[PDB]
């Protein structure tokens, strides 16, 4: 380009070529799970009377 644009492109480049900063990204996924089933049940069977 023209020397006037060359000097303009030279500033654009210098700004655009800036050392891009780095990022360390730690994620922390914590899950906790449990629960209580309970099955208690009573059955009575009698020949004479009847059963449940």
């Amino acid at each position: 380009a023209q020397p006037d644009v060359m000097a303009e492109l030279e500033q654009v480049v210098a700004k655009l070529d800036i050392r891009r900063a780095q990022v360390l990204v730690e994620a922390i996924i914590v899950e906790i799970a449990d629960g209580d089933g309970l099955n208690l049940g009573v059955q009575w069977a009698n020949t004479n009377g009847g059963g449940t």
């Binding site: 303009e8 654009v12 700004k15 655009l16 070529d17 800036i18 891009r20």
Partner: peptide, 27 residues
């Protein structure tokens, strides 16, 4: 990249966005 589209309306002046340094070059 997203800002380029926004500004393109305002212009529509000559724009591009550098995906790397995430900078906008307008003239």
């Amino acid at each position: 990249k997203d800002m380029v589209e926004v500004l393109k309306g305002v212009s529509s002046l000559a724009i591009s966005a550098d995906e790397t340094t995430n900078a906008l070059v307008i003239t």
